Subunit: 303 residues, 4 copies
């Protein structure tokens, strides 16, 4: 039938002291609510198991490490996978990943796709890390993602998830046309991910009142120009004195926003998705094989 | 001072029998009014010297050729260049180009940049030709650009126009992130062009009510993602029984629409442009050198 | 809890020859689908049991009368009421009403609210009839609502429907701030209705490309300024050679569009509704008792 | 000719210590630039001669009074009127009005219309005063307009200004459909005013990211529903540690935003205005005489 119901599980703030066990209870509730509304897949936020720690400068490595996952799923997150399999609803979960390879402690801002059987069918690691690497005094709050993570090493893959071709993006990635295009060329039908986007931008505060605008503009344009359904799940609200943007959403291949959250708390939204709708764009106005002229795009791939 | 006033000269319909002399009178009127409002550059539509002939299926080559320019400017168009130099206002003019090489005819959908001294300082040829190739009987009007024009052979260049770096796009090109990105990488501060966009699309009529949405979405996203000012000049209204989309516009590097037309007739709109505004994006959130990861965008350039 | 899930049942075209029995099958399918997605109420379109007959000029009264309901529900529509009661989902149904009172054949463009028990709990009759009364040759298609209906005689009432205060509007009514305000003053928490809105306006065709814009603008502003959730269910698509606007939607008290259709066929959309959310507006920025100054609004009620 | 060019003079922050002389220099600069761009009228912000003092809790009456005008224009403001007459450009100026009647002080948040001859041709006093009445300790900044001003006593008048019918609104007034409707009924062709709108609202912070949305939604709906051109001039930027919303704008009678500011500093925007454009709405879809049903709007005027 190539039909399904897609859901987004927006998260309200996660406190510094809030435990992973408490967070999983919240994730379970939304996954259950989504299933009750007929959803077959639910998108969760970026770094959805803890508070957004990149806002602080750490001096103790042990303390920094505590915010990362060394297993997936571990005993605490396991319940989410079991419930997903029980109710037949897959999900996209974001978390901080720590893996030791060749004597190096590698840190990634990661997301995984789990199918309706509870099996991990794909992983992606954030390639476009926003922010800075060194502590910057002029900022009211830090954004040290470049210091706490290294660029992803998996490229922008597209995976088969319960008969749907899905690609992942994480937060800032959604603002880069290149990320969307690579997955579009790989045939993605659904492009989804999560985000933590403060409504205040220290470097350019004159853009603060445009935060929602820029976020939604990026989702709509990406979907439209690649003929893909998309979804963005945000962790929102006042988290540790920093306001995070709401407006989690689901978008059609036409760029039309078909579902939008209106609260800054845990909230589930859903939308009926017809995977064949992608054809209205990809077989016509954006029929790549018939219209693209790659011989003129070389500069985009130059190092 | 990095400051200027940009204008867009929207054109109402141009009849099949309307002469180039009559069209020049209309173009001169708008160029003069823009200058009176302080503009230093005015953007005109795609194929701005004739009716949109690609809507018909031609069977006579002599008839087809009549809609093309064999020289630029010819005696009839020259007055526009002279007035531009007199008032100190450059312009972007679209037209059908016919070139004869060793007895072989080359056809392009073209646009040129003329500076405030009336000198041609740049050319661009439409790379993404929309529509179909063969005659399709069911359609109320055809769209045969692929038959009447060859894909441009100049790539997506960026030129110096009176101390402003300007890149050109033509109609359908504005829907392709690749076009915008190439010029963004080349340092464009202003990306502009014209269009003829019917509000009805025979193959996908279910998108007719989204014509304005898709047009504006493309302009906003392109500007924002590349931190560039942009402008789109349309030829609009009921032309030869085909309704063409209005909403000509000027957009800031933030994606904000700063000027918009509301009529479907010849109309001039203007906006103050600060070339240093591009930095709010290009030195921060979209600081290419610091954030882009071209090693992972290779597929975009693969033939 | 004051929580519920609201649904909209958009209808694709209804043919001149399509029977009420066939239409009810379609309505039943959507009501069933909505219930499966957890909805407790579903909004159907204006004149949802037949093709939009006001587009034609009738000379035979018997033929005109055939498009009206003399009972509600009659044997053919009864199944919809039974299913609603079975599944616990109320609905808003629009239809043409014919009633003889005091020797006069009264014709109304009507809508009724049916609760989750299948009981009719309220009626409304369209007060703002758009279009004209006499045949007008210059129009490609007629809009004789003023000829086939008389203004409603029930005012703009607000009813208690399963613990929710609901007010009704029909089509054109949504464009009048007075309609929304009267229901807002009566405490409406949900304001809903249906519509048949052609994408072509004979009197002012220069507004054709703004059809979606004007429709959505009206819904968003109405909701925001009255702190009410709202929903608009359209009968859409190409019906008898006349294209009808899509974009059926559900809107939050903040004016945010939380659900939107993307096809021009029978389509169900849903959204979680928190009746207390109305307080964010009605107890603050739009706290009527604290901010309204009726002594200066007299002209609005002058005859 | 029913034609003119309308301008908006957005103001960047005005410091607590910034003198009226310094502010007039800034106002003169914008009025002169607007004239150079062909404008015949320029709209200035609400309380455009001082910092937004209602953000503080005053304990000294002499201090409060210092922010009010006891005459209009006084020697310091006179130069603005003289230049307006010289260049032929009228304006809408907002200021705090202090009147002494029989030894009793009357306080109003006021705006006046000055024609191109420099003559005061109309006055309006803010009717919908937003905010709270008592000091609220938890708030980072107060909003005590209800304490420092009396509700206007002039109603919502419409005046003749150089052959244009103009109505005035002030800040919060733009959110009330009643204000717009009264002036629409009085035949306003242009409805304009200024505003000071913080991007943060202490009691309902969950609406902070919607500040621009609510502002623009109000302007678009008001214009469309009344078939009137409109303009909103804001005093914006970080003023005394409080961020004020930018996005000053000019809107067509169709609800289309034709001009928008993008900076948070003194900025001039302009737009061509055709007074007969109002007819596209007022003689058709919103032809009051033909469509309105005031006999059913009574509740709106009930005290």
């Amino acid at each position: 039938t190539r039909q399904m119901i897609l859901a987004v599980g927006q998260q309200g703030p996660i406190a510094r002291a809030e435990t992973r066990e408490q967070v999983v209870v919240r994730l379970l509730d939304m996954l259950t609510k989504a299933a009750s509304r007929g959803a077959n897949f639910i998108v969760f936020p970026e770094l959805a198991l803890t508070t957004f720690f990149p806002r602080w400068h750490f001096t103790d490595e042990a303390e920094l490490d505590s915010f990362y996952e060394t297993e997936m799923p571990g005993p605490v997150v396991r319940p989410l996978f079991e419930k997903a399999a029980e109710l037949g609803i897959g999900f996209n979960l974001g978390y901080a990943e720590l893996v030791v390879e060749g004597g190096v402690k590698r840190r990634f801002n990661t997301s995984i796709l789990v199918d309706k059987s509870g099996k991990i069918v794909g992983k992606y690691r954030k390639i476009h890390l926003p922010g800075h690497k060194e502590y910057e005094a002029y900022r009211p709050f830090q954004h040290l993602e470049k210091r706490y993570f290294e660029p992803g090493d998996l490229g922008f893959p597209v995976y088969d998830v319960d008969a749907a071709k899905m690609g992942m993006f994480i937060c800032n990635d959604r603002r880069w046309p290149e990320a969307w295009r690579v997955m579009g060329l790989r045939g993605a039908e659904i492009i989804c991910g999560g985000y933590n986007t403060p409504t205040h931008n220290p470097p350019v505060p004159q853009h603060d009142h445009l935060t929602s605008f820029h976020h939604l503009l990026s989702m709509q344009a990406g979907s439209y120009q690649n003929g893909a359904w998309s979804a963005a799940a945000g962790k929102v609200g006042m988290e540790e004195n920093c306001m995070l943007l709401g407006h989690s959403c689901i978008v059609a291949p036409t760029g039309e926003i078909v579902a939008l959250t209106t609260t800054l708390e845990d909230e589930v939204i859903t939308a009926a998705v017809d995977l064949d709708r992608c054809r209205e764009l990809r077989e016509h106005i954006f029929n790549f094989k018939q219209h693209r002229q790659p011989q003129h795009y070389g500069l985009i791939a130059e190092l």
